[PDB]
């Protein structure tokens, strides 16, 4: 199911994705998102699989999500799922 998405490369990833994320990924990912990626990978590899990993500090609203980014939440508690991937996050002050 999601194992294929986990193993496939960036070309098949963008092909499965819509044109918006294709354009975004082709234009670039930026060192901020790269550092966030490596930090979240370290946090997930260090965290116990039996508990949900913590959110990310220095919050920002403009990175996409990858099924390899799973387990992430936002410091707004919707756990990321494969059917939420092509949206970014948002989740800011919209309080009623």
């Amino acid at each position: 199911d999601l194992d294929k998405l986990l193993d496939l490369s960036q070309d098949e990833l963008i092909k499965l994705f819509k044109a918006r994320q294709r354009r975004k990924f082709q234009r670039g990912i930026s060192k901020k998102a790269k550092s966030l990626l490596k930090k979240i990978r370290k946090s997930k590899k260090n965290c116990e699989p039996g508990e949900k990993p913590n959110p990310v500090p220095t919050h920002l609203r403009n990175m996409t999500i990858i099924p390899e980014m799973v387990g992430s939440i936002v410091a707004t508690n919707v756990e990321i799922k494969p059917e939420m991937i092509g949206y970014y996050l948002g989740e800011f002050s919209i309080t009623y």
Binding site: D1, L16, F17, K18, V78, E83, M84, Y87, G90, I94
Partner: protein
């Protein structure tokens, strides 16, 4: 002759055949237009002499037109990202897939999800 009742209302006898198969569904006049083209019905005729053979031809056409030249872009609901592919899905049952798409976006419960849930438009009616 006139007044033919099928899965959807087709009381269209005197009105044209093309407008009849647009009114049954595909009211955007393109699914119905291409279905008429594939089934080879002359628009010059009316809907009062539609035959059951042509109706069966119409159902043969709309049953997965993917094998037909109807392209993926012209196919309604092109991707609907998942493990598979979908198609234009006619009328009453067609409503079921937008129902379950609404369910998927509800369980997604993102900003646009709650905007649709609480009773707001996607872009905002702007009551400012």
């Amino acid at each position: 002759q006139h007044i033919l009742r099928i899965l959807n209302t087709n009381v269209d006898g005197k009105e044209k055949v093309i407008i009849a198969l647009t009114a049954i569904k595909g009211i955007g006049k393109r699914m119905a237009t291409v279905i008429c083209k594939q089934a080879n019905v002359d628009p010059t005729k009316r809907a009062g002499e539609l035959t059951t053979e042509e109706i069966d031809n119409i159902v043969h056409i709309m049953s997965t037109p993917t094998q037909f030249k109807i392209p993926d872009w012209f196919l309604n609901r092109r991707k609907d990202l998942k493990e598979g592919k979908n198609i234009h899905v006619i009328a009453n049952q067609l409503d079921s897939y937008l129902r379950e798409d609404l369910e998927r976006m509800k369980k997604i419960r993102l900003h646009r999800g709650l905007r649709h849930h609480w009773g707001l438009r996607v872009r905002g009616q702007h009551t400012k």
